[PDB]
Amino acid sequence: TLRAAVFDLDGVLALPAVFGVLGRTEEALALPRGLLNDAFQKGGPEGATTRLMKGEITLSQWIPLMEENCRKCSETAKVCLPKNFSIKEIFDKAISARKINRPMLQAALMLRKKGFTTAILTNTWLDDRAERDGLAQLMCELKMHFDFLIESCQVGMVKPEPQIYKFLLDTLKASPSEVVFLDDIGANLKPARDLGMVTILVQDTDTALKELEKVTGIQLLNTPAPLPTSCNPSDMSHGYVTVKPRVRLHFVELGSGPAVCLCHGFPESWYSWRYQIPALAQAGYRVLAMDMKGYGESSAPPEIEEYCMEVLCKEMVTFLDKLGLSQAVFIGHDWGGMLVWYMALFYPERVRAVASLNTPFIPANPNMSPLESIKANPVFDYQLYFQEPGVAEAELEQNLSRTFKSLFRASDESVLSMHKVCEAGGLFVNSPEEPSLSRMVTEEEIQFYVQQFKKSGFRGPLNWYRNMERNWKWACKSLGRKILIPALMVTAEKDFVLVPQMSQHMEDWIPHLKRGHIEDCGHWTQMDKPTEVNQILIKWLDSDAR
Amino acid sequence: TLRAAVFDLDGVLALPAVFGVLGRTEEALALPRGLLNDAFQKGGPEGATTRLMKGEITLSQWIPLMEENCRKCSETAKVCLPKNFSIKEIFDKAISARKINRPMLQAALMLRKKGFTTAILTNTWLDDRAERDGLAQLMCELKMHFDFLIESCQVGMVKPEPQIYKFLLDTLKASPSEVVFLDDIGANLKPARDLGMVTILVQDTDTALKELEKVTGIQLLNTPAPLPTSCNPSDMSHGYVTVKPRVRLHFVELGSGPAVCLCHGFPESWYSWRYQIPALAQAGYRVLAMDMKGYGESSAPPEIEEYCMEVLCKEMVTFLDKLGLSQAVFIGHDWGGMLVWYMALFYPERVRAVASLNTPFIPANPNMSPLESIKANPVFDYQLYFQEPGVAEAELEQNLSRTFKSLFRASDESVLSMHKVCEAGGLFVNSPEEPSLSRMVTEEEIQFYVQQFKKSGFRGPLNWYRNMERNWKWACKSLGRKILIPALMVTAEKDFVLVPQMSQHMEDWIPHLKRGHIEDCGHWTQMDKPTEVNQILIKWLDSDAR
Numbered sequence A, B: 001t002l003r004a005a006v007f008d009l010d011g012v013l014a015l016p017a018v019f020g021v022l023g024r025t026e027e028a029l030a031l032p033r034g035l036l037n038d039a040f041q042k043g044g045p046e047g048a049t050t051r052l053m054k055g056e057i058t059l060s061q062w063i064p065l066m067e068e069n070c071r072k073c074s075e076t077a078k079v080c081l082p083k084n085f086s087i088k089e090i091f092d093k094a095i096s097a098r099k100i101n102r103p104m105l106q107a108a109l110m111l112r113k114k115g116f117t118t119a120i121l122t123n124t125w126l127d128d129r130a131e132r133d134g135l136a137q138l139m140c141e142l143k144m145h146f147d148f149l150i151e152s153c154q155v156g157m158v159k160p161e162p163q164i165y166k167f168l169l170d171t172l173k174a175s176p177s178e179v180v181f182l183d184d185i186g187a188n189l190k191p192a193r194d195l196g197m198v199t200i201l202v203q204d205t206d207t208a209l210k211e212l213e214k215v216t217g218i219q220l221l222n223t224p225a226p227l228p229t230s231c232n233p234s235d236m237s238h239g240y241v242t243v244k245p246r247v248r249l250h251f252v253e254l255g256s257g258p259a260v261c262l263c264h265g266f267p268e269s270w271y272s273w274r275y276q277i278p279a280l281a282q283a284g285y286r287v288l289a290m291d292m293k294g295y296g297e298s299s300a301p302p303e304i305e306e307y308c309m310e311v312l313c314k315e316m317v318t319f320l321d322k323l324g325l326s327q328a329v330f331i332g333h334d335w336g337g338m339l340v341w342y343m344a345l346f347y348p349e350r351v352r353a354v355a356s357l358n359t360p361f362i363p364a365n366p367n368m369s370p371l372e373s374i375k376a377n378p379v380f381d382y383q384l385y386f387q388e389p390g391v392a393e394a395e396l397e398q399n400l401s402r403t404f405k406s407l408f409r410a411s412d413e414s415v416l417s418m419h420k421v422c423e424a425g426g427l428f429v430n431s432p433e434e435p436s437l438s439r440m441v442t443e444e445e446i447q448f449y450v451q452q453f454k455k456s457g458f459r460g461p462l463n464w465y466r467n468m469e470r471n472w473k474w475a476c477k478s479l480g481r482k483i484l485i486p487a488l489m490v491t492a493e494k495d496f497v498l499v500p501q502m503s504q505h506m507e508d509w510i511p512h513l514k515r516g517h518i519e520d521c522g523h524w525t526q527m528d529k530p531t532e533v534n535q536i537l538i539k540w541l542d543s544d545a546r
């Protein structure tokens, strides 16, 4: 019974293959068929390419050797190489043209998710070309999805030498009959077959996947659309900044490029951005996903005023200063969405662009207290419940698993009513003791939140609702301003607290506002519709945030 | 007696001033003298500029108001504004031209170092122009050197209103007679004078500094060249990556731009890069200063093999992968210099550029064991002392303060002999028990190292010398390679272990090698000659690392 799947890079996980471009170059230059491919393989195990694949020489040291082989080959064929024939040029664009074979990676990912140990086995070189980064970026994206990456230039062995196959079985901790091996080269497939491995000769991906699905018994073809890549907490880089004595801010960091600060809502974690962090980093951004003040590994002082918008904003400015960042794109959801609008209002020079998910920007009414206007809308009764220090903490901290299982639900899964929470005497009053596990979350994801909330509980998180009057007074000072920096508002159709209609007057204050909208999406936008969230944010970042 | 110094931004800390460009624009366009300045101040406390300075409106909302004031002014003067008169354009280049007044910041820094509480008090706006980053970068660089930054648009008060002066005294916790106030505008100086503050009317910086030096009694003019900005450990962002189970890597991070990985030597810390971290970040790089394996807050497994070059290099590759970094510039010193050459030799696709301080690149002799070649040079006897597990740890860990005080010394300060350490039976045998404090380090800097080394001691650090044979065998596989990626070698004249002559044959293997050289510099390059190290690295990074 198969338990490991081994994939080649060139012609299997990466398309098009180099020897396919070697053939396309022969045709384009009207050279004899196989001339360039014969030059490439010249001297077999004793030649220039074998030395390169074993790591004896780098790619640059190899170029003039491939040049001489092409001259010597063209001399025997009694042909002429063109005026400006260049191996450096041919190989540069061949490497550059090569992209990930998306259906093949998806099947590799399906196999791994279903218990298989996966590996990439490749005949590759030490790339020291000035353009090496393109390949380095390609390898980084592929390697993260596999248990092993075996490169010929790193092990000093090559395919089809039987030693690399014996090396592969040892790293896999599997006997041959337990391994599926996918290769585009028949000669490199033969030693795996000889040992007793299941082998697939890759030509077109569809035929190879049909063969792979039949042999594994796992459906790889015609599968439902997969969720975006998520985060494993212990595989992330964890950052920590002291913004003031006894107040420390925790963040997860991934990627290079413009700084993208992600600000979660109530009662969440940096982990709420799990499906955005890899996608946004892959899109060419340096993601800094916050544990907001009061949450996770960040400091949770007990005083209410410590959570007023003026203090939180000033602290995010200090966070930027301490990391040596003149600007960041601020993307917020829920309470994070609110903070993000205030960062744009009060510190526009530190805000590259601003994006909110569900949270609209509504100017303060100077002729009315916010505490008396909360009462005007029946949906916001839970806000009044959240007011008295102690009450909601006791209910929310009682059974942590029940809290997140009850809250983290889709549009068609509600167990709790948003209205008359005060009259009922709680948020979980006519709610089950053991709520069913929502479709959006696994048991593992709920437990990550459970463990996070054991450190400081709900006092710090609840204090964000406890600065209404203080927040109002500060917001009133911004009444003559306009948001003129690039801004995005993302509405969610089925969010019944942060309703899309609440965002309708936004253009009066943000005239150049760009919009996004998600249908059949509840309040927990990021985990409800991660593929949609990623498309909207990436499209907006590349057009408006550089 | 003065204890606080308050500085204005425009015309004091930042040159040239805006109203100087307003006058230069009048001349260039042949407009009546003061026309643009009269337009700017139109309506005094009830006008457009006062609203902008108080933060009622943003800069962009202000542009069309300044436009109307210019039209109305030009109408009364009975003149015509040019065909393509634009306030946006005038202000854009005025803000852009404005740089830090370096002698003024240096004096502000001298004052702070000598006990003064320093502050910037400025009449400024909320900048929401598409070009706002230039100013945001200017403010970031200045603000870090002061105890306070008071901005009119943030406090809702302006100079010359006496409330801002009363606000300044409160934040300073000082009475007027304790404060020096430097301003280029006489009108904004008058309320500080009225309260009883020492005031300096800034015109030319030299005259103002002569006045400031006379009144404080502190020498600010004709001072010796200051050391570059250093790091306060608790003001840094601290990053943490798990590279494998039970092996975690700690780093300090500052700045945005290309990733610059700094690799310290034996027996050091990320803190050895203290004078490079701010300079390199200011130069437009994202600095990642490592605590190498075995050191500080990074993991120190006890096994020798865990510190072999193959393992350390593989772990730095994992460090890059986990942070989502396809490449980094690798800058190493001492043992870090060695690692850095091996990263370029084994993973050139992950190495943007490579730089070594003191450590040359010498290829492995395949016809000789390194353990028998260490004996060929008398300087490397301490290496033989470092071999037996336990011996050197006991001596180095005995008195931590004595260890760093004895080791961290300049060329003209040696207390320990590099030769016959085995015969003497130790590194500190004929060395003082209470060594004098070297010129390169303060008591505080030595104690940071003392506290760092209390966690794991010297086992992990010493194990880097305990993989000679293992390292040799791995290095032998690279014997046919060449370093063809951008590379820098920095030699130090008075380093008597890593002598500049040891680097002479390097071009045979690194043909495009760029060089650096530091005269009257010992082994501890970074702290011995920080200004020189910074100049060499920044010049090389901007030409070769982008």
Ligand SMILES: CCCN(CCC)S(=O)(=O)c1ccc2[nH]c(-c3ccccc3)nc2c1
Pocket: A265, A266, A267, A334, A335, A338, A359, A360, A361, A362, A373, A374, A380, A382, A383, A497
């Ligand atoms: C009274 C107006 C309501 N909000 C203003 C929206 C412009 S609010 O600032 O009080 C606010 C903001 C974020 C919120 N998030 C939630 C929330 C409630 C239950 C579960 C999760 C989030 N309630 C919120 C209220």
Ligand SMILES: CCCN(CCC)S(=O)(=O)c1ccc2[nH]c(-c3ccccc3)nc2c1
Pocket: B265, B266, B267, B334, B335, B338, B359, B360, B361, B362, B373, B374, B380, B382, B383, B497
């Ligand atoms: C035998 C050759 C010596 N070195 C090779 C230089 C190409 S080494 O790799 O053993 C080496 C490397 C870094 C070192 N650093 C020190 C050192 C000694 C005392 C104090 C601080 C550093 N000794 C070192 C030896």
